[PDB]
Amino acid sequence: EEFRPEMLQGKKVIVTGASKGIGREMAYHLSKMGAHVVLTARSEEGLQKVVSRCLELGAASAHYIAGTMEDMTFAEQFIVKAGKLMGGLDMLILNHITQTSLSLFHDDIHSVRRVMEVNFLSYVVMSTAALPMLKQSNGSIAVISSLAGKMTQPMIAPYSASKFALDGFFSTIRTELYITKVNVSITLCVLGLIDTETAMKEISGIINAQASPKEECALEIIKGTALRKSEVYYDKSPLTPILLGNPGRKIMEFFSLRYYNKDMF
Amino acid sequence: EEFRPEMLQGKKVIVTGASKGIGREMAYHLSKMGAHVVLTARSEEGLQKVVSRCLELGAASAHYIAGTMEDMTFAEQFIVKAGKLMGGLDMLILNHITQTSLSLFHDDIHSVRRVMEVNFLSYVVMSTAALPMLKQSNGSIAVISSLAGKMTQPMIAPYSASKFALDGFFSTIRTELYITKVNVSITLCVLGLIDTETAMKEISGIINAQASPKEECALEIIKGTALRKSEVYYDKSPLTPILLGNPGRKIMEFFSLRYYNKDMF
Ligand SMILES: NC(=O)c1ccc[n+]([C@@H]2O[C@H](COP(=O)([O-])OP(=O)(O)OC[C@H]3O[C@@H](n4cnc5c(N)ncnc54)[C@H](OP(=O)(O)O)[C@@H]3O)[C@@H](O)[C@H]2O)c1
């Protein structure tokens, strides 16, 4: 099956971490496709600015609810509100991350808790809150991850821990939805280094690799999620999906189901 | 190189979750090898019983400090105390897990938080607290994981999330120790189904797979950690380490270091 921008015309989409970077670009692409969009981040001003441009780009409707994903009550309330604002949900885009700087791990335990809370726990809170709505529309979740969520690199231990945690959790949920015959798709988006100002600022003088453009990245996520793919790899090397693909895991995953009591689902 | 039980004679070892299952078996094996051992779990009574048998089995010294790994201050204090009790640390065995039952994920954010806190955060708290001592003895950490920490299955989403998180974190730490020329080894132990009373009581009527013996399991962990292996796979099928090994990840991990400023380490 091939992608059509028509697939997102009139769809009700949530985009977290939408005030800058990849999130803002997804907001923009979704608007040009004519979707109903509800955006979130902490910066009320930044969200206001992107909602304006969204309406201008051709968004069916554009809403925002500012807040921190450090608060689990906020994370779940946000979904309920957004769902009411659009009268449903077709696609949930879990994209925000808490701030992290490249550092050889030393003793920041409070940073590690904040990373797990924002980058991991909030995503499970929101997916659980959005699932009844998504079950109705036969919807989709896009879980934004990284190469650091499939492999390891120095100076990003807490971050890598959170992206790995998302893979572990959402891959279990995906399998669970499939075996219970629930038509809700889960797309884990494995991203390489991207053009975002925050990313580029963070790596400066530490990492030398070339970054991919944020606009193309945002579109590849949307396309992949719309096409209901389990995984999307977006990175400069075409070797990355073959190297990180892990068909061995896929074989083990399929074969292991033979030991489960089918009555459980 | 090949393993000798002499390698653990007089070594100062910490074993978490040592009142039953694999932890108690590791305690026993370590005692028979003549090591100094400090054990922890919540049950003060259970720890007392295993310390008695440890002394009887031939332990150089055997101590215990009861408590919950839900408390991060306890987790950190425990390491400090245990290190003082033995006058050093040669091997840290992170094994405890919070209680989890096989269930298709519904909700229970509070359970997910507890799982991440106990199964993941406490391990990072303890490894950070033990690292100065381990740096001195050119020591080792054994991080106990599962097949569910390398691949996915139904009904164990929070648990799988925590084991995946450990891989993400500790693989970063391992690489960091190597590049900073610090001779501390990290052994991730990927375990299949083990015949613990707790494991067999959870999979009953749900899962039909054969379990491996806990005594052999405990010894394979100790052997692997002593031999300073990055990963130990212990499971009934000899296919498991080939299927879950992911050499592609290993290739990308090595090659990607070419982009880091070597001056950072
Ligand atoms: N850029 C890359 O090179 C790269 C590489 C691989 C993967 N990724 C993944 O791509 C996604 C987007 O990354 P990006 O580089 O575009 O990020 P970015 O420019 O820093 O944007 C992060 C977004 O999250 C929001 N946010 C930050 N803290 C928050 C909090 N406490 N609660 C709620 N929202 C919060 C930010 O807005 P506020 O500050 O206003 O709240 C912002 O809109 C992430 O999931 C990241 O893991 C990025």
Ligand SMILES: NC(=O)c1ccc[n+]([C@@H]2O[C@H](COP(=O)([O-])OP(=O)(O)OC[C@H]3O[C@@H](n4cnc5c(N)ncnc54)[C@H](OP(=O)(O)O)[C@@H]3O)[C@@H](O)[C@H]2O)c1
């Ligand atoms: N058994 C298997 O089939 C299997 C398979 C794959 C991997 N594994 C891994 O193997 C390791 C050992 O598992 P097991 O089956 O031997 O477990 P087990 O029999 O349930 O023992 C868990 C241990 O952790 C302690 N513990 C529980 N809650 C705790 C808490 N809040 N704070 C501190 N300690 C706590 C328990 O004692 P208290 O209750 O007295 O605190 C007990 O000593 C785990 O890391 C597990 O992930 C096991």
Ligand SMILES: CC(C)(O)c1cccn2c(C3(c4ccc(Cl)cc4)CC3)nnc12
């Ligand atoms: C995933 C990949 C390609 O391996 C990767 C490597 C290095 C940096 N990456 C980042 C940023 C980041 C992450 C974590 C922290 Cl602590 C700081 C900044 C720059 C945004 N996102 N992905 C990557």
Ligand SMILES: CC(C)(O)c1cccn2c(C3(c4ccc(Cl)cc4)CC3)nnc12
């Ligand atoms: C790792 C492996 C082989 O895929 C696996 C499959 C199934 C059960 N496993 C378990 C137990 C467990 C785990 C999580 C919860 Cl919620 C409950 C009970 C039985 C102990 N440990 N590992 C496994």
Ligand SMILES: CC(C)(O)c1cccn2c(C3(c4ccc(Cl)cc4)CC3)nnc12
């Ligand atoms: C059912 C359970 C416990 O969740 C499970 C998970 C993962 C592996 N399991 C296996 C083995 C296996 C299966 C298929 C292949 Cl191709 C290879 C090896 C190790 C024997 N048996 N049961 C399981």
Ligand SMILES: CC(C)(O)c1cccn2c(C3(c4ccc(Cl)cc4)CC3)nnc12
């Ligand atoms: C340095 C950084 C950002 O952490 C990083 C992490 C992971 C992959 N990276 C790559 C690519 C690559 C490298 C080696 C091979 Cl064999 C294949 C593909 C994708 C181009 N370039 N930089 C990185």
